[PDB]
Design a protein around this motif. Sequence first.
Motif, PDB file in Angstrom:
ATOM      1  N   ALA B  11      67.475  96.251  48.850  1.00 62.66           N
ATOM      2  CA  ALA B  11      67.989  97.343  48.033  1.00 62.66           C
ATOM      3  C   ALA B  11      69.491  97.213  47.815  1.00 62.66           C
ATOM      4  O   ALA B  11      69.998  97.539  46.731  1.00 62.66           O
ATOM      5  N   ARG B  12      70.223  96.764  48.838  1.00 63.57           N
ATOM      6  CA  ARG B  12      71.664  96.604  48.673  1.00 63.57           C
ATOM      7  C   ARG B  12      71.981  95.559  47.612  1.00 63.57           C
ATOM      8  O   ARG B  12      72.955  95.701  46.860  1.00 63.57           O
ATOM      9  N   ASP B  13      71.167  94.505  47.540  1.00 60.93           N
ATOM     10  CA  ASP B  13      71.387  93.466  46.534  1.00 60.93           C
ATOM     11  C   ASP B  13      71.213  94.006  45.118  1.00 60.93           C
ATOM     12  O   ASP B  13      71.934  93.603  44.200  1.00 60.93           O
ATOM     13  N   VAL B  14      70.260  94.916  44.910  1.00 70.05           N
ATOM     14  CA  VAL B  14      69.944  95.309  43.548  1.00 70.05           C
ATOM     15  C   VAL B  14      70.704  96.540  43.061  1.00 70.05           C
ATOM     16  O   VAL B  14      71.032  96.636  41.877  1.00 70.05           O
ATOM     17  N   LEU B  15      70.997  97.490  43.939  1.00 67.32           N
ATOM     18  CA  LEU B  15      71.527  98.743  43.427  1.00 67.32           C
ATOM     19  C   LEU B  15      73.024  98.631  43.138  1.00 67.32           C
ATOM     20  O   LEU B  15      73.749  97.979  43.892  1.00 67.32           O
ATOM     21  N   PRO B  16      73.502  99.303  42.107  1.00 67.38           N
ATOM     22  CA  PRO B  16      74.950  99.491  41.948  1.00 67.38           C
ATOM     23  C   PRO B  16      75.524 100.071  43.233  1.00 67.38           C
ATOM     24  O   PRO B  16      74.903 100.921  43.877  1.00 67.38           O
ATOM     25  N   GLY B  17      76.725  99.633  43.588  1.00 68.49           N
ATOM     26  CA  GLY B  17      77.332 100.079  44.839  1.00 68.49           C
ATOM     27  C   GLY B  17      77.419 101.586  44.989  1.00 68.49           C
ATOM     28  O   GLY B  17      77.169 102.119  46.079  1.00 68.49           O
ATOM     29  N   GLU B  18      77.755 102.305  43.922  1.00 67.60           N
ATOM     30  CA  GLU B  18      77.915 103.749  44.047  1.00 67.60           C
ATOM     31  C   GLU B  18      76.581 104.443  44.272  1.00 67.60           C
ATOM     32  O   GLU B  18      76.541 105.539  44.871  1.00 67.60           O
TER      33      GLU B  18
END
Lengths: 332, 332, 332, 332
Positions: B11-18
């Motif tokens: 999930a960290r790889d795909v989602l925008p940071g915010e």
Amino acid sequence: YVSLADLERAARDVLPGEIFDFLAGGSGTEASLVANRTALERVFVIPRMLRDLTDVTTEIDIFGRRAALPMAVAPVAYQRLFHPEGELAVARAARDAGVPYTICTLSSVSLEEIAAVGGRPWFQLFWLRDEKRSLDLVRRAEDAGCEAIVFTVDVPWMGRRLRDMRNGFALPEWVTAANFFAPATWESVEAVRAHTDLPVVLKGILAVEDARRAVDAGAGGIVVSNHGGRQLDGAVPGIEMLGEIVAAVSGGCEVLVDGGIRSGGDVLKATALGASAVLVGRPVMWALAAAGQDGVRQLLELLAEEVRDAMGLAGCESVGAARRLNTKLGVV
Amino acid sequence: YVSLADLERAARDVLPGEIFDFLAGGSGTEASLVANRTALERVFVIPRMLRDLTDVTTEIDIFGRRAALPMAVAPVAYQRLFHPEGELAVARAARDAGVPYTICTLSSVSLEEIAAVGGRPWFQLFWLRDEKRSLDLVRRAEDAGCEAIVFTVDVPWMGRRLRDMRNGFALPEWVTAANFFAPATWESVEAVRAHTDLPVVLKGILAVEDARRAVDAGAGGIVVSNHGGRQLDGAVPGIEMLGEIVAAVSGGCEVLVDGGIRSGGDVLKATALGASAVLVGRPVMWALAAAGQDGVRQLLELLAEEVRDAMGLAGCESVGAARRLNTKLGVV
Amino acid sequence: YVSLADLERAARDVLPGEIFDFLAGGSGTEASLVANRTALERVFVIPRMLRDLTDVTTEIDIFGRRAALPMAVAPVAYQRLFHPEGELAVARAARDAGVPYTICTLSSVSLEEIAAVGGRPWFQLFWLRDEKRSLDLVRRAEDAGCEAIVFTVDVPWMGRRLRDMRNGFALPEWVTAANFFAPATWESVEAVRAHTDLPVVLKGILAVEDARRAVDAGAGGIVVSNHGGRQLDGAVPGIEMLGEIVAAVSGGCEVLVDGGIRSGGDVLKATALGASAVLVGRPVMWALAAAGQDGVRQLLELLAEEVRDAMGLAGCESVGAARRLNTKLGVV
Amino acid sequence: YVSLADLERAARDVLPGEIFDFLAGGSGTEASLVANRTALERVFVIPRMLRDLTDVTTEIDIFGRRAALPMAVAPVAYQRLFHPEGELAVARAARDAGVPYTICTLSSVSLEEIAAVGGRPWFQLFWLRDEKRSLDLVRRAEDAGCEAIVFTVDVPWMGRRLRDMRNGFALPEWVTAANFFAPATWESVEAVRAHTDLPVVLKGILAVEDARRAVDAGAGGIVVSNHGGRQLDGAVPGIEMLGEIVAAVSGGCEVLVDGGIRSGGDVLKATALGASAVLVGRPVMWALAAAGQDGVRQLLELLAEEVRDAMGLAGCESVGAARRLNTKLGVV
Ligand SMILES: Cc1cc2cc3c(=O)[nH]c(=O)nc-3n(C[C@H](O)[C@H](O)[C@H](O)COP(=O)(O)O)c2cc1C
Ligand SMILES: Cc1cc2cc3c(=O)[nH]c(=O)nc-3n(C[C@H](O)[C@H](O)[C@H](O)COP(=O)(O)O)c2cc1C
Ligand SMILES: Cc1cc2cc3c(=O)[nH]c(=O)nc-3n(C[C@H](O)[C@H](O)[C@H](O)COP(=O)(O)O)c2cc1C
Ligand SMILES: Cc1cc2cc3c(=O)[nH]c(=O)nc-3n(C[C@H](O)[C@H](O)[C@H](O)COP(=O)(O)O)c2cc1C
């Protein structure tokens, strides 16, 4: 080698990574694997001074035989993964050191071959697909001269080994279960107890009431153990249950412990918490991987030296005296 | 995926940071967010051995329905932030896994659409600007076939989310509160209880006396919870209050817990401390972000496997047996 | 700025290193400085839910005046080290925020000038070379409109500040003790108490019996404090003695605490442990260094917002309700 | 030098690595070496305020002599390893500081030469190959003017020093045991006690019952000690046994402690736990290595300043008052 950690470093250098991980790993997040070490590190011994050390002895009598140290080699499966001589190398070194060797149901050399090495062989049992086959395996071990049945009670199935999953680990074609499962119950224990006059030792007990029931069931011993952190991830370390279990059985069977023993000082802590003896698993395999039979010999000589050193520095001329030492928990 | 942490990494790889920060973050210094994990890591289970595991079942009966696991999907707002199918993807996977799904008042798809997916929908309520509107929202959920009202009691207002402040986070124009607040009191609870025959579950209880008052107020359940560390920074973890709360209510309502559940072993710890069931929040959204409905399916299958593994290794053929396990605190 | 730590970072950027170290440092190994933070981090609050929050107020009455928050600015020497307006900037912002400001005996602007700013000035006293001079200084403060005498009782001499030694730190020529010592005893306290009708507050009490003696001596308050870790290295944090001290004085004087308060949540923890109010030292100077009076204003507005947020999330409409909250120690 | 850690850094720069390791190291994994420091770091003092500090004195009377501080130089073997003047440099500085110096059986300068320096020499005894030789060594020390016999009771043999093994460390040809073993028992203690009217101090006591037996045996003191972590690896720190031991002997002998004392604040903690005095080992050798006699002088002046500072800040005009301070354990 001057510490067991020297052997770990040597084994890591030689073994393929996936085999090192099969050996080192635990289940799940490895919380129980780590906790076995943390738990020992928080125990401190209160040594006694000025006692007679003229004849310090590390020997014990257990299951009807004298052992040179309060320790046995734990059952570890498939030892040919670590060295071509596998179980034979380990059993030969254990025999020469006067240390009992536990033959695994999942050994990569047959139990009869390992027993022919001599020494003090115990046999670790996994419950088989039915009672009849299970008892035939017990009777093989007895016929071959094994002196105790170490019934493993914490493996209704093997735990979830994430390192093995991630590595896609499988046995090489050259390693097999040379003695060739359903979950064990208390009825299985009674079937084994009635089938042999050998002492039955239940390995993997952590609950106080299960230790009491083991005595009531006719066990000659128990091993207080979370299976080296390989079974239930989040199971309490055996060393954290040991004192309460020793008090509850109140001499009704031998109480061994394992998980994370990495020095003679750790042996001393286990005995001061009330253990009759310890089992040692991974370090014996590090020595086997590093240098074969001679490696195992060197490890056992080092452990013997560390145990004698720790006992004498703590004022103990015998293992019984070490069991009367007091301990204090510290914050590490 | 072999652990829930694999899903977090994906999930960290795909989602925008915010958006990842909206999901991951807590209030203030995130002391309560971290403590939810620390608290679980310090609990160890004392497993039982040699029990009959012929028919291990992870099922429970709760709020009048059988659930496949002692777990529900926690209410998490605005799930279209994480995947275009948002709540529909999660609800479909929860239905197929036999796991209740909690529809949020702040859902990005209307409660009636999510309820039409089927399954076991619960509805999470925030108290609205007045009693009349609040009760109309309860009646919508009931008319749509929701089976429990999960009244969130720890949000008189949303906490201070420093990651969201620092990122300047705001909902994209394409995400809205598709069902479209004043602080709730005990009078609000009574207004809801008199307006529906559905069980009312108070989510966000941490004080023992508030748990007792919830039973006296006619709640059918409570969720012992610090809102995933998102509300009061410095609020005790629910897992640290659970045992005392279970003793105080003494069977008068169901007692759920949430915060930091990241494995089947953590489910087992919660049940051994007395929980009827857990909620799981962030990991379900990691799976949704990573792979949509199929990702959520894979997470729920993994959790089911971990729960069955942990229960059987601990000697528990049912969730009730797991609630009778003992635990020991350790030092991590 | 969204946290007090934002102000620390800004102050570190602007101040000369030796002045930052004068402000940040403690005595000896800084064990007590660190322990002030560790001690707060281990306290968790058990919040209450569903209470009426119609009129949440952070105000208190203390030493005969209403204060806007349960907090005062701690006495910090030589504030012109941090900004050219020094104490005047801080006192102006404290006045506008409704927060008492403690004028230091070692102020870099005279006490009469700072008192002329208005607000709620308290005066911190160090015992002087004799009784007569000490009492003249008390009478100056009283004549100038100070409303309490905060007698510092933990400085028979200043502690060993190794950062200052290593930096060779000395006051610049442009910073002086603008109001211009022998060790204080209980007789000194009685001399002050008989010389003024203002409340006398003993700052630096850690032993329970000293808190009881302070009440017997006629103190109107005490500050439970290790002087921000600047005095005895190895002194217990005030927050670790607070609950026992509040029980022993049993309402006989106000009980304040300081050391390490870095958020409104920390204020809430202090009040839940029984404090009447807190003092805040270093963060106020970070704000002064960063942006002068406006910086201090922003800090006090941020703390007010955090205190109101924490109180309401914990179910407290007043500071008295926050003092009735329970806490639990956790492991961080 | 403003802290003892400054001396450690200076000694590390100058000494050959293998000699630094001989000095710094402990046995085994060094668990007891580390725990000596951890144990002190977890103790916090509860200081008293407002007491008369007109005549603060750090002096004590012990073994019939006034000492300037509640401290002595511990017995450390082979001090010519650290500086060419070895024991003579240390003994001269201890004499000039009014601090007793313990002459080691394994000194690299003869006990008679060191005693001729003057001061308050004590003599540390290891039990020799027989009673007759042992007692001749006691009588040499007595004839040379030593004022106490510090009988080391925790060395039936030296522990396992893995750093020394790994370095292949051996004494240089220019360092010898200039006074030139069998394990000591309680009978050995009685032989020494009957051979001298000097006070006999048993060094290395950790068990409460051994402290009681030491009093019953006629010891004038004990040193509660794990030998600086050099003997049993896993032995409890002396500081963790001190309070229980002081209560059990109930004034029947002097109770000293050692291990990890690194500041005047640590001296204060030891005294608040009930010690009559401390021994300091490694830091004295760091000072000797760094700057010879003058280095030792500077260390002792620094320790004197730190002890006076800590005592006065804690409200103690005498060491007896410091023994009446209370402490609290904290979490570091
Ligand atoms: C690679 C590996 C295989 C096995 C297979 C078995 C087994 O078929 N039966 C059994 O009953 N116990 C096993 N064990 C557990 C072992 O017997 C000890 O319980 C732990 O090794 C003690 O902890 P360590 O000394 O290793 O820390 C194993 C341990 C390791 C590391
Ligand atoms: C992004 C995000 C939004 C919400 C919105 C809500 C909400 O509108 N109502 C409610 O009642 N609870 C909420 N929650 C809390 C949730 O229901 C669980 O209490 C925690 O997620 C459990 O902890 P984890 O499993 O996440 O550790 C949320 C949690 C997260 C992460
Ligand atoms: C640079 C500096 C100077 C002084 C001078 C004084 C003083 O002449 N009189 C007094 O009575 N207290 C002082 N103090 C202690 C202060 O009043 C508070 O006790 C702590 O600052 C609370 O801890 P923090 O909020 O800073 O953590 C000081 C604190 C700092 C940082
Ligand atoms: C290099 C070295 C040699 C010796 C030799 C002796 C000895 O022949 N007899 C004895 O009775 N104690 C010894 N000790 C222990 C010492 O007397 C103190 O017990 C510890 O040094 C206190 O801890 P630290 O102050 O060093 O932490 C030693 C300590 C060190 C470091």
